[PDB]
Write a protein that binds this ligand. Structure first.
Ligand SMILES: [Mg+2]
Ligand SMILES: [Mg+2]
Ligand SMILES: [Zn+2]
Ligand SMILES: [Zn+2]
Ligand SMILES: [Zn+2]
Ligand SMILES: [Zn+2]
Lengths: 162, 162
DNA sequence: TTGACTCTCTTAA
DNA sequence: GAGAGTCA
DNA sequence: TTGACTCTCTTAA
DNA sequence: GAGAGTCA
């Protein structure tokens, strides 16, 4: 099994490679009518992606390193968290983008949490709009807002009460 | 079926049958430290469920009627909305529980909206905690809260900025 | 050891 | 959150 | 015609 | 949001 030093070396090589990805400046809503700026380190759209990286799905990548003749592979956003617990409250931990930009691999834009917590950030009002996440959001979620509901609650007769 | 008259008849028979489901009172968080009361009309746990109803999954049911000698079948919660557009902005419309209680078939607890809008209600602060849904929530979402994030954003080196 | 592809799986609406 | 088939 | 089961599918994290 | 195989 890989030692602590070996895991730290994997994290360090990953950071060195991701740090050379193109850095894209994005202006984003923070909530409360505030606007802020995020700097995403974006994996390229097509090969080559960077040393150790390969695409396993339309917006899925993996990081691969060979250590003492054994091939090791991780989801490309999971590498910053290899020294952390991998479950909590009986739920698997997932890499969660605070910038909501799947191509971004900036570890300052990632956290490590259940899939439900991860999904819920899509609707958060944001750090200046009422975010209650203990690990605070960096921006208002892209799906926050009044929504586009087509039809609301209704009945034709009188069989129901709310 | 095809005619507006036939659709209204389907909706009316569905309402009559669901109106005889047991009414279960649920006390719920509204947000803002307030509590309210919902009256859910709950489909039985096992057969028989009611005229026209059958279970296709652990918490999935279908309503079926024979019109013009043809069988017509629909998701059990979609029947109130048979006269509404079945898509919005190119996204499929779904039956969405405002009470977050899948066995409930009270149409006063249902709306018709995209799957994204539907999902997002799980994290809403609620009608007394800041809900901005244009079709307002009936309760705070069951997943609202600080979350249980295991690890936040971090880097080992100095290659990244937020 | 490495790159660039291939495939299928999990969750909860 | 969905659609559709097999039996009786 | 109605009931009670069976199976797989969609979406976007 | 994930893991794993093939081939050169
Ligand atoms: Mg996410
Ligand atoms: Mg729902
Ligand atoms: Zn980013
Ligand atoms: Zn938040
Ligand atoms: Zn209900
Ligand atoms: Zn709401």
């Amino acid at each position: 099994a890989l030692t602590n030093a070996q895991i730290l070396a994997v994290i360090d090589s990953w950071e060195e490679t991701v740090g050379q990805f193109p850095v894209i400046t994005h202006h984003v809503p923070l909530g409360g009518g505030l606007q802020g700026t995020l700097h995403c380190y974006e994996i390229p759209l097509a090969a080559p992606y960077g040393v150790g990286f390969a695409k396993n799905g339309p917006t899925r990548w993996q990081y691969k390193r060979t250590i003492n003749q054994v091939v090791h592979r991780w989801g490309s956003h999971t590498v910053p968290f290899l020294l952390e617990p991998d479950n909590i409250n009986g739920k698997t931990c997932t890499a969660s983008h605070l910038c909501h930009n799947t191509r971004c691999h900036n570890p300052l834009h990632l956290c490590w949490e259940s899939l439900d917590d991860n999904k819920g950030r899509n609707w958060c009002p944001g750090p200046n709009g009422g975010c209650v996440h203990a690990v605070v959001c960096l921006r208002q979620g892209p799906l926050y807002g009044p929504g586009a509901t087509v039809a609301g609650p209704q009945q034709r007769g009188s069989h129901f009460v709310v």
